[PDB]
Each structure stands twice: as structure tokens, then as C-alpha cells.
Write a protein that binds this ligand. Structure first.
Ligand SMILES: [Ca+2]
Length: 369
């Protein structure tokens, strides 16, 4: 049912039933970036000004060496644009502050990125932090990145910060040269596979002619002209043990299952984003994560920034209270008859599905989180 089309970020509150919630004006939000954000900040000004919104207070943080390379990565600007504009739109047009935690590009291997995560946790000023990044978890494990970064995310969770991470754009084929079809061989993305973050998968979003929510299916747009799959990451970690709160999803391995929740990701139903001054229609789980971040930041502002790391609460609340989500039921995250299928309740492409924010807010008012 419904129509597939692009959406302005300011539509995400209506789509996900967040209009009645406070904005994120009382919550500080972080974004992890690789390199600088100079063009991104100009595109953010274009965004707020075009949409008639109050200006956003920003800070940029050099997270590594002061001699490091924080120049703009030109392609990267599109990611940081997607992230920042989608957060602010989903947040209802206001955030307390947006902090860009910039990784040094001249640091060895993944150490610049690790240091960006570390700085966000050490500072402990952002309540919610977006990470629209990922790569094969087995590569991260082999070189020690996984272990180093998991320690940082563990500290974040213990201090009550929410890291939100895109589940991946390769469907089940994360480790096969970043998304090439591989039959029955399935893998997942890091850092989404950490049990210390919220992993956010991807949907195809249909809206009614009046712009309301109609339905969501799995994000799976098939292969590009190079032969790479574009679909929501989902599956289970081969390394991370299942956190006890995931025991409510019976019949799954003793591993961290992902994603937890999902939001819009299909390019064909994606966000209209200003990138080097020009509007582009962009998707991915790189979109879904910042949608979650902006919506969650609203709930933080409604709760005096007192909500802790929410994974256990999501699993207990949603399993007992199906009205809190839009349960995705149709589609798959592989190719050629392979991959996982959506179904009733939690599934590997989409986790619990998307949040109905005003219903979740009412639940939190009654029950805590
Ligand atoms: Ca489902």
C-alpha cells in the first residue's frame, strides 16, 4: 500500500509519530566522523535556513593528535550531511548542541576512529551518538580493533550514553568484499555487532498521499551496476555472546543478534539531503541510524536525559507490547533466494522494526525505561 518517494528530514517526526513529543532542544547529540566537516556545516546552515528552523549550535572536536589531518573528506561530507540533517529533522528541528567527533585521518589503521569513539565517551557530554559507519566484524576482530572499541562502548553504556550504529548496507554479505553475493555465506558489520550499542537496520518506507505512515518492508534494492548488494545488514555476531535481554527472541544462537530496531533506509524512499549545496535523495542504514538518534534524543529531552542505555528495556517492552513498533513482515536481506526473511516479531533483517514514538513515550511515562 502507500507510495515510495523521497522525504524531507522534517517529515520523519510525522512518519514515526513523534510530533507530539518534545524536541531534542534539551539533549546534546554527537556524530562520529572521519575527517573534517567544513562543507557539512555549510550544508547544515542551508538545511536549517531552507526549512525555517532556528539555527543549530555546533562544535567540532579534533579527537586525536593536534597535528592530525582533519581536512574534509569530500565523499564523507555526504555522510555527515545525511547524519546531521536527518538527526535535526527527526528531533523536531532542534537539538541542544550537535558535536562532531572527528577522527584523525593520518592515524594508523583504525586508531583514529577508535580515538573518536574514546573522546565521545571520555567527554561524556553527548547523551546520544550517531555512528553511520561499519565494516566486516571479522576484519575488526583480526586486527584488534573490535576488542579496543568494545571496551569504549562498554564504558559508554555503563555511563548511560546511547551509541546508535547503522547495521550495514551489504545485506548478509558484509564480509564478501563489502556486499558481493555469496550464496549461503552470511556475516555482519562492526560496530553494529557490539552488544554495547543500538544496531539500527533498514526499511522501505511507504507513505499515504497525506504523508502519513502507510507500511514498511525490508530494505533490499538488489545489485548495483558493479554487482554489489544494497540491503539492510542483519544476522548475528560470530564473536559476541548474546546479552541476556535478547533471550526473549527464542530459537536463535548464543550470539548478539542484530539489528535491534530499524527505520527508513531505501534510497527510493530516502531522505532529501543538501550535499555541497545540491539536494540528493540518499538512503542506507546510514539514514536509519540518525533517524533513531534524533527520535531518541526527543525522548531523552522528555525524560531529563535520565534514560540509560536502552537495549534491555527495548527487548522487554517491545516483546510484551507489540503496539510500540511497526513490525516489518515482508522481504529479505540477501540475493538469489539466500538471506534472512522478515516475519512476525523480531527478525534478522529488521529486528523489532520501527518505533512508534508517542506510544513509546506513553509507555516510558507509565513504566520507566
Ligand atoms: Ca518482524
Amino acid at each position: 500500500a502507500g507510495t515510495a518517494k523521497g522525504h524531507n528530514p522534517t517529515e520523519f517526526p510525522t512518519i514515526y509519530d513523534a510530533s507530539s513529543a518534545p524536541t531534542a532542544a534539551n539533549t546534546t547529540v554527537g556524530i562520529i566522523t572521519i575527517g573534517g566537516v567544513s562543507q557539512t556545516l555549510q550544508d547544515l546552515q542551508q538545511f536549517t535556513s531552507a526549512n525555517g528552523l532556528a539555527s543549530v549550535n555546533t562544535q567540532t572536536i579534533q579527537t586525536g593528535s593536534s597535528n592530525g589531518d582533519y581536512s574534509d573528506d569530500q565523499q564523507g561530507q555526504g555522510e555527515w550531511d545525511l547524519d546531521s540533517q536527518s538527526i535535526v529533522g527527526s528531533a523536531g528541528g532542534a537539538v541542544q548542541q550537535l558535536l562532531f567527533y572527528m577522527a584523525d585521518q593520518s592515524a594508523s589503521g583504525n586508531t583514529g576512529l577508535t580515538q573518536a569513539f574514546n573522546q565521545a565517551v571520555s567527554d561524556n557530554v553527548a547523551k546520544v551518538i550517531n555512528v553511520s559507519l561499519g565494516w566486516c566484524e571479522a576484519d575488526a576482530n583480526a586486527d584488534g580493533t573490535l576488542q579496543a572499541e568494545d571496551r569504549i562502548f562498554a564504558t559508554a553504556a555503563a555511563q548511560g550514553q546511547t551509541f546508535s550504529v547503522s547495521s550495514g548496507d551489504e545485506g548478509v554479505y558484509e564480509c564478501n568484499n563489502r556486499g558481493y553475493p555469496d550464496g549461503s555465506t552470511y556475516s555482519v558489520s562492526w560496530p553494529a555487532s557490539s552488544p554495547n550499542v543500538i544496531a539500527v537496520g533498514g526499511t522501505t518506507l511507504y507513505t499515504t498521499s497525506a504523508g502519513a505512515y502507510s507500511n514498511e518492508t525490508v530494505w533490499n534494492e538488489g545489485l548495483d551496476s558493479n554487482g554489489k548488494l544494497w540491503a539492510t545488514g542483519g544476522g548475528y555476531s560470530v564473536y559476541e555472546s548474546k546479552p541476556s535481554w535478547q533471550s526473549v527472541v527464542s530459537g536463535t544462537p548464543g550470539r548478539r543478534l542484530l539489528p535491534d530496531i530499524s527505520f527508513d533506509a531505501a534510497q527510493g524512499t530516502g531522505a532529501l539531503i543538501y550535499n555541497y549545496g545540491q539536494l540528493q535523495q540518499i538512503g542506507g542504514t546510514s539514514l536509519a541510524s540518525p533517524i533513531f538518534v534524533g527520535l531518541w534524543a526527543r525522548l531523552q529531552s522528555a525524560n531529563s536525559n535520565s534514560l540509560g542505555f536502552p537495549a534491555a528495556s527495548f527487548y522487554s517492552a517491545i516483546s510484551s507490547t507489540p503496539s510500540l513498533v511497526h513490525d516489518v513482515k515482508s522481504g529479505n536481506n540477501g540475493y538469489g533466494g539466500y538471506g534472512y526473511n522478515a516475519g512476525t516479531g523480531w527478525d534478522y533483517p529488521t529486528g523489532w522494526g520501527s518505533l512508534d514514538i508517542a506510544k513509546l513515550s506513553a509507555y516510558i511515562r507509565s513504566n520507566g525505561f
